[PDB]
Design an enzyme around this catalytic site. Structure first.
Site: not given
Ligand SMILES: Cc1[nH]nc2c1N=C(c1ccccc1Cl)c1cnc(N3CCOCC3)cc1N2
Ligand SMILES: Cc1[nH]nc2c1N=C(c1ccccc1Cl)c1cnc(N3CCOCC3)cc1N2
Ligand SMILES: Cc1[nH]nc2c1N=C(c1ccccc1Cl)c1cnc(N3CCOCC3)cc1N2
Ligand SMILES: Cc1[nH]nc2c1N=C(c1ccccc1Cl)c1cnc(N3CCOCC3)cc1N2
Ligand SMILES: [Cl-]
Lengths: 277, 283, 285, 275
Positions: C22-24, C26, C51, C100, C105, C150-151
């Site tokens: 994913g992308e943010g 930040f 990060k 992880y 989210n 969401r976070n």
């Molecule tokens: C910092 C961090 N710590 N752990 C994380 C994570 N970032 C995200 C994330 C999710 C939404 C918005 C922003 C972010 Cl940064 C994350 C996203 N998608 C995951 N999945 C992959 C496989 O398919 C299902 C979904 C897993 C994640 N885990």
């Protein structure tokens, strides 16, 4: 904090102060000359409406709302116009037209050099016309008292105090913070307002005009006044006004809002009177 | 319209009309000699202030005066708050009979002495307007309009609070944001009331700080040189009026304390009564 | 050139990056595997998400991470909140590693299962974890200003974890933190006092938490539905509060309303929320 | 709530809401059929609106963005304002619609392993280049020039977009602009000049010539400042003809006076297309 409409805004520096016209509880205004308001480079004289040292939030809310109300209403001969509005770095200042003679109630009180009956009808006629323009624009005044109706230099009447106005186009307030004596029974008890209520207030306004600025509901306390209206005590006809007006004037004061005559009807009724006088 | 309070009512005939003690924009008060009221059942004339609606009237103005009569009966009697001798609710126009202050209201009491007033005497009034507030807020009420212009000084100088009509009962729920913000002057208002629209007991203490400022700098206007429109912008900023000349820092620290951004952490009304008691004791 | 923190440092060689998650605004997080990052389990590879700065980097973003990293050092480990495992601070690119969570989210994950299967007890249970997580932050005198659904990252096997800590700041000696005004916060999840008076506190967080229950209760629904942010201020002064979701029990809704009280002094503190939720939680069977 | 400018305001009823057209973290833009414009016909436009997570600062940025757009006027190669909704209800700012989205993606989706030829790559540069020229002399500077913020127009007309960080002509915070695209003159001393954008343009040229490849590949943002402090400059992309590579070096000149002026860049480019 307050956004500035480009067309209305006027520079603070251009305006020049004058001896204050008045210092009321409702608001403070200072006569002033503003140059190039239209630019024609004409140093017009405009009364400025502004806040007091201590201002109630409702006053702050009301004056600003009053300024906004003027924008919506089109320029009309009777209603007082808003020429320019200032929302600069400093405190909010509103610029209005200047009416040399003061309000209607105070103008008649100083003529008890004489006021002929025809002029009184003419003064009454202009108010109906003003309300008629407001009715077309769907604006309800909520006051329509002689004391806040500015009569301009050369005797052309001007409605005023648009701060209380609301755009009509039932339940936002209990219709408090308004003079009861000039207030309609429907608004007083059920807290809803409509064009008819202005006409009832306008009916009270006619007594102000025809009693040479005299106070309405003589000899009756406001607390006592709630009762008479339910039972029907309507004030007796003023001496100068002709009897035909009274039937019209009394008709404005009605138990039920639907019965009360609309402004279109009043102006038309009034137009003839001037003609045959 | 108006009911019957047998203890409260005072017949119209007994009370005598008099010269008016000022005509406020909101309402008119006229001085009167009350024949009927009994200091100790004398049935001798006692001077009094009659508060009456003037004939041209606001729709709310009738209500506010009625509320003032109602608000005071609930409050009871305290030496720091204005008395409530009588009402003429039963007949004619409403007449409210309230005890008179010879010296007059505190705000102009101080301006006219810019006479001689000792520094402590000034503390005493501030200390006092605090004792009165404590009782007022200990009766589950919020005055909502504390300002110097409304604290009335009696002959022999015993501070009495006034204009109780606005303050509302806060007894089981704390004045949630019903209000449309037409209730109070911006300069003496709290920020939460100004912005959130909520008023609690603590907001009287924010108002009280301005009251400390008015009393301390000789009945002077607060936020001077600052237009009301501009005032809001720096309230969020947190800029506050500086210490008035000839005010001890300890009072000023107490003043700044009242001005806390967070209502919950503002000094309690009991604390204000308690501190000043210590502060005043030193000299 | 940042000053080294000895405990936090994690050698770059041990960490070997994995595909991005994913992308943010930040920056970005890329899944990585770090060897023996977790103490008491040495010489093992535990999946970690790193990060790191986005190829295009906002200057605030660089500063933001440094601040974000600082917050992790202070909060301390908790089952329910994301915890720092290690960090890369030395010469070269700065990779910050954080736990992880397999599922992702929380708001999106809920939106995954609107009729997967989620029973009502899990929804109540899920709220309990977040409330417990918040208590530690309250206990540790820190405020999470941006507390929204969401976070919140939910791990594999649903151990809910708090996230997006850059906004939160310490309150060791001063409760209000009135200095920051309108810098970067959502209007809908912001509390009323903070939105207007620019003051944030723990009672102020519970209001954000109040909304968080609603997002979670209606399967990650947007808060204050059908109402624009621009016009949000007018309703807020008037007292309009969002209606209870159809899924919600009355008891939860009163707590929701309870968490939305206008006066901060009055709203429940996190200890009460966790305690109240626990009982409600106990009777779930 | 917000003062309504009569020229700019477009009635809410007139413009049908439409559907989403891409997304950004800061704000949201959604495509719509906006009847009218003085064509007096119904044609599509993309309205930019506040997103759900409304930052307190985000509203101010939106207003500034609208303000920036108003003063600029209209040019062929730059996205220009098409009127905004203003005072009534929610605030949507309306801008002109671009068919293929941001240029950086457009170039990436046109890498082999009718793709654009070398003249087409040069053509984008000229347009983009002239646009800065239009922007130049308006006493304005974009402050964020990169491929993503450049939008292609159906039928391939390039348009500069996302004007919020522009201040029509050095106390700026300088927090919200990317390090790689920033001028060295600009990044270090925080100074902002009309011609400081040539470096941004120099970086932008690179994105076009590698069909969107990220600039300074392999160099992390954190370590980027050190190279800039010393003597360094990005390598010339393979696709670009050598003459362009020098232009990039000229565009990246160490001192602000030295970077070629926007008229110069545009004039230099014309010969190349002409040649
Ligand atoms: C910092 C961090 N710590 N752990 C994380 C994570 N970032 C995200 C994330 C999710 C939404 C918005 C922003 C972010 Cl940064 C994350 C996203 N998608 C995951 N999945 C992959 C496989 O398919 C299902 C979904 C897993 C994640 N885990
Ligand atoms: C806003 C405004 N616009 N125009 C105004 C005017 N306010 C009034 C006014 C009067 C009483 C109470 C309040 C107000 Cl605001 C006014 C007063 N006195 C005027 N006169 C000067 C010359 O000699 C007679 C007296 C003229 C006035 N005209
Ligand atoms: C309600 C009430 N209760 N008691 C009152 C009183 N009203 C006032 C008053 C003061 C300012 C504004 C409004 C009002 Cl209504 C008052 C005024 N002036 C007094 N003094 C008489 C002798 O000379 C000095 C002055 C006494 C007063 N007493
Ligand atoms: C301001 C503006 N004007 N015109 C626009 C537009 N916004 C964008 C955009 C692009 C990148 C980042 C942010 C934004 Cl806001 C946009 C994106 N993607 C489009 N494409 C539709 C068809 O499918 C492929 C994608 C179209 C767009 N149009
Ligand atoms: Cl509080």
């Amino acid at each position: 904090e307050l956004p500035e409409d480009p067309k209305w805004e006027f520079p603070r520096d251009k305006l020049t102060l004058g001896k204050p016209l008045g210092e009321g509880c409702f608001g403070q205004v200072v006569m002033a000359e503003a140059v190039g308001i239209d630019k024609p480079k004409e140093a017009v004289t405009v009364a400025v409406k502004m806040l007091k040292d201590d201002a109630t939030e409702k006053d702050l809310s009301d004056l600003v709302s009053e300024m906004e109300m003027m924008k919506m209403i089109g320029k009309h001969k009777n209603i007082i116009n808003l020429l320019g509005a200032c929302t600069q770095d400093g405190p909010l200042y509103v610029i209005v037209e200047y009416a040399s003679k003061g309000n209607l109630r105070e103008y008649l009180r100083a003529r008890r050099e004489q006021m002929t009956f025809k002029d009184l009808v003419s003064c009454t006629y202009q108010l109906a016309r003003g309300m008629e323009y407001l009715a077309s624009q769907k604006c309800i005044h909520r006051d329509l008292a002689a004391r806040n109706v500015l009569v301009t230099e050369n005797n052309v009447m001007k409605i005023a105090d648009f701060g209380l106005a609301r755009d009509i186009n039932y339940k936002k307030t209990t219709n408090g913070r308004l003079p009861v004596k000039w207030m309609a029974p429907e608004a007083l008890f059920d807290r809803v307002y409509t064009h008819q209520s202005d006409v009832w207030s306008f009916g009270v306004l006619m007594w102000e005009i025809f009693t040479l600025g005299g106070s309405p509901y003589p000899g009756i306390p406001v607390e006592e006044l709630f009762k008479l209206l339910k039972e029907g005590h309507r004030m007796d006809k003023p001496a100068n006004c002709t009897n035909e007006l009274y039937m019209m004037m009394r008709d404005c004061w009605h138990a039920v809002p639907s019965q009360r005559p609309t402004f279109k009807q009043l102006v038309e009724d009034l137009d003839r009177i001037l003609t045959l006088t």
